[PDB]
Write a protein that binds this DNA or RNA. Structure first.
Ligand SMILES: [Zn+2]
Ligand SMILES: [Zn+2]
Lengths: 163, 365, 365, 163
DNA sequence: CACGTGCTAGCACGTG
DNA sequence: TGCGAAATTCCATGACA
DNA sequence: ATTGTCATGGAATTTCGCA
DNA sequence: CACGTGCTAGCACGTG
DNA sequence: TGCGAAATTCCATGACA
DNA sequence: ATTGTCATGGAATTTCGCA
């Protein structure tokens, strides 16, 4: 229909378990559907409980029209569906075992998945502290398909920390 | 009796002639419209002026009139003003009758994330054992972040600003010389991330105007929301943060969200005007809005203001003056005039101080 | 869908014609220069306006623009202002943008001892176990008496004022509604001596301006005298009292002593100009000075002030508002307009209050 | 020489002992030489000590050119002469046993002396409390020789408590 | 004892 | 007369709260 | 039923000493 | 521990 | 065009300190 | 070495619907 924009769709997923860095065994991955921006939230478990804690911090900044995820327990709960409706966030669901995305999101969720793991052996079981730097790299990473960074597409200006 | 040739009828510069200068009791007198007054020698004046002034450490006129009662000489005020410039106590206690120069309206930061303004709101009413809010206002857009803290410490300022800088890093962070901000630990944290710390002049909160004036909207809305309810605000910072970022400045026509993103997110009354453009055709338009945004210019000077020149004698408002203690420090000198409104002084201690002219009065005489 | 005849092409008062009003999704839309907006029925508007305003309890413009994003109807602002007049929290928290009317300059009391102005200075630094000063300023002359007290009690106000009234009795005594002054004991003491107690409006110290402004000269001189010394002021009240009474007001040309006696006593720089007249020829001249003394007139009104009319909706500055609590009481009504600057209101409790317009803002809408 | 004025001369004297009203056994009498105004100060003894206490309260209001008194101990002391000089008050002394005054002062010191004593039996051994009323009467008393009150000659207007 | 009215304290943090 | 310097008046800006 | 005030010192302005 | 800098408490009195 | 009503812009006044 | 700001609502003013 009409052109893609940010906040149109946030793609979420958990990653873990990981090596216990200060109790945080998982990571919540939120990626803007159009700019491929990335937010990362260290959680202690992949529960609605901590999925809410985190998406609140996020939805205090900006609010997606749609959240899209796998049918992971945390995402399919009533708790979460109630939390969603409350804010006018539409829920969309990747039909089981056959994951769904646009090109962009598939690769970004990949970049992370691997970039996380490299700075998991290279800088070992103390990863918690580094998620902010990860997130910055991720959002300042250059895009082939659109020759602009997430930090550029999102804010419309150059990062003050280029990569 | 040295310039006494007037007794013989000789003329001395500055003494009128159409009077008659006689002698009585052993004192040189003069017949005047006012009455009959006593002229003392040059040697005896400075002392008399002092005696008179000292009665109530009176100003120019009030000091003269006391002397008017008994004496006349040429340009008495000339001698009286000389004395008020020397009286230490008057100079350090009398307030000023000269207003500061008109305010500067600093250019709005160019891009979002150029400048960050911070301050701490509180102590507040204990909500979930939190007592303060760290307010972080972006210069250009006026996008604002709200972090609940248990104290206004570096310890916890750092904590918040990390969660913040995950989104982006700012070039410059500006704050009041608040304890937690002028620590070395904060200097570190900022050096590490390579961000320049820029500091307001002391006791001059207009400098942090952008935050303070956001504080206002923050306290105001908090109140409207906590009416009739007991004040538990912790759970409201989220609600306030979003709402405020997403409220139009009438003179700008734009919400801070818009000035930061170019489209609304999924918040009530979502503006869709730029729906049909590509993100690229849209992000361009934003670069445009940001450039031609309304901006105020300095208001006209007050009829009786003053502006600081180098090497001028100037005094500094006492930090927190004691009870019955003078409100001004010993007079000092202007070294550098950073702008029409900020000055570096040879401090009274005797350091370098960068102070606002507001905390300054020009030394009189 | 009730005023929907626009779908067939019928005209309804206040709706323009050079547009086209279609239907989509089940909603009456309109094509506009702004974009394409949604017109809801009359029944659905009041609610929408509220939804919008409630987001940040926004003012007129900021509230409209949020609705602008989605809707158009005839004179939306008309509906929005209607709502801001009904929102309780906004009315009791938003400050005012209307300034008080210009100040009155009450006629100087006619004779010495017509009016007495009193206030208490302190707590001060403990000198001989005294902590306060009772300042007594005579209206007409500005002659001032200084009584050291151990507390600001009726107990001790009475004590002082007796020693005072031995000289004369005043017609009227004016004070701030300070605890010790609004006691019944003081009412007694004053009734007995047959003196009328006249009281300032609450939280409005300009009312006691004559004292307060003498306080200033009292604190100021005390300080100049206590420089470098530790602050023991008890033994200085005498010295200050005399000195102040005997210092010229430049715009009057006269010391309060002079305005009270017609000749100086035996104090330094004693004016003798009326030496040769009889006491009778002298006391007459005084009656003259007192009549033609300089007097200021009210300054011009501020471009955007307000003045109170009877039965107008008006709200009162909250006494001592709590933290995060609104700064204005529930709106009220003007009963009596005592002058352009004082008003008696149907209080919120729901008494009679005589308040200064300064502690009042006109209710908006 | 030149016409009489107020503050030109204050005439002082002690009166007592009197019946112990709250310890005050004496009274200091100060009368303006020209207006015949009267101030009264209850003291515990006719010492320089309490003569100073009292004349301070007075000389904080206004200051005489001259004080004149009998050669009473309190008045002739060094202490008092030092106190006097300090303020530029000239001391004058009624040559012993043959008291000195103008007409006016002689009668006023009399008025008091008797007016005190009447409200000493009529209202008995509690007199302290009444000195202010005495003083007011005294200063609002009408004058034959000049047809004006002390309170009129001093302030140049009518008392707000006429007598 | 809490409430209305006229005054100044007080506490925080980081550093020396 | 009119002109330069002195002297007196004008006033807005702050501190009392 | 009550109401702002006045010391202060550059600047503006009116008076003064002398022709 | 006192000092510099950015915040709100606090205490008084007389009456109900 | 030009006129009345609507709608948008102007701005000084306060609160953040 | 640094600098006041902006929601607000009557009032003033510029744009609008219709001839
Ligand atoms: Zn002085
Ligand atoms: Zn509201």
């Amino acid at each position: 229909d009409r052109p893609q924009k940010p906040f149109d769709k946030f793609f979420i997923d958990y990653i873990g378990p990981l090596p216990p860095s200060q109790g945080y065994l998982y990571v919540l991955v939120v990626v803007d559907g159009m700019t491929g921006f990335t937010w990362l939230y260290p959680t202690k478990a992949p529960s609605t409980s901590a999925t809410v804690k985190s998406l609140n911090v996020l939805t205090s900044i900006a609010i997606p029209k749609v959240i899209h995820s796998d049918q992971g327990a945390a995402f399919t709960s009533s708790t979460f569906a109630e939390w969603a409706k409350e804010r006018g966030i539409h829920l969309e669901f990747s039909t089981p075992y056959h994951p769904q995305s646009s090109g962009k999101v598939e690769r970004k969720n990949s970049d992370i998945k691997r970039l996380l793991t490299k700075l998991l052996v290279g800088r070992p079981t103390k990863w918690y502290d580094l998620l902010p730097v990860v997130q910055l790299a991720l959002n300042n990473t250059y895009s082939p398909v659109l020759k602009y960074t997430p930090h550029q597409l999102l804010f419309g200006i150059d990062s003050n920390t280029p990569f | 009796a040295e310039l006494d040739q007037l007794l013989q009828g000789h003329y001395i510069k500055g003494y009128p002639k159409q009077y008659t200068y006689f002698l009585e009791d052993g004192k040189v007198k003069v017949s005047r419209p006012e009455g009959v007054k006593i002229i003392p020698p040059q040697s005896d004046r400075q002392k008399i002026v002092l005696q008179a002034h000292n009665l109530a450490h009176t100003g120019r006129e009030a000091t003269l009139l006391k002397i008017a009662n008994l004496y006349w000489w040429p340009n008495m005020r000339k001698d009286v003003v000389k004395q008020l410039g020397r009286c230490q106590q008057c100079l350090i206690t009398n307030a000023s009758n000269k207003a500061s120069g008109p305010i500067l309206r600093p250019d709005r930061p160019q891009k979002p994330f150029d400048k960050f303004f911070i301050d701490y709101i509180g102590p507040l009413p204990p909500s979930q054992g939190y007592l303060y809010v760290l307010v972080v206002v972006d210069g250009m857009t006026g996008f604002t972040w709200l972090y609940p803290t248990k104290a206004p410490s570096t310890s916890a300022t750092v904590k918040s600003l990390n969660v913040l800088t995950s989104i982006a890093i700012p070039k410059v962070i500006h704050s009041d010389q608040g304890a937690a901000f002028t620590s070395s630990t904060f200097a570190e944290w900022a050096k590490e991330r390579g961000i320049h710390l820029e500091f307001s002049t002391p006791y001059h909160p207009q400098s942090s105007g952008k935050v303070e004036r956001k504080n206002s909207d923050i306290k105001r809305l908090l109140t409207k929301l906590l009416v009739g309810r007991p004040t538990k605000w912790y759970d409201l910072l989220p609600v306030v943060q979003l709402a405020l970022n997403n409220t139009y400045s009438p003179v700008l026509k734009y919400t801070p969200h818009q000035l930061l993103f170019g489209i609304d997110s999924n918040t009530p009354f979502a503006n869709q005007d730029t729906l049909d453009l590509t993100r690229e055709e849209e992000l361009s338009l934003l670069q445009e809005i940001r450039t031609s945004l309304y901006h105020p210019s300095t208001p006209p000077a007050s009829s009786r203001s003053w502006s600081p020149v180098v090497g001028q004698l100037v005094q500094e408002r006492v930090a927190r003056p004691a009870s019955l203690r003078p409100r001004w420090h010993k007079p000092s000198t202007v070294l550098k005039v950073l702008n029409p409104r900020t000055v570096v002084i040879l401090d009274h201690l005797g350091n370098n101080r960068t102070v606002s002219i507001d905390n300054l009065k020009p030394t009189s005489h």
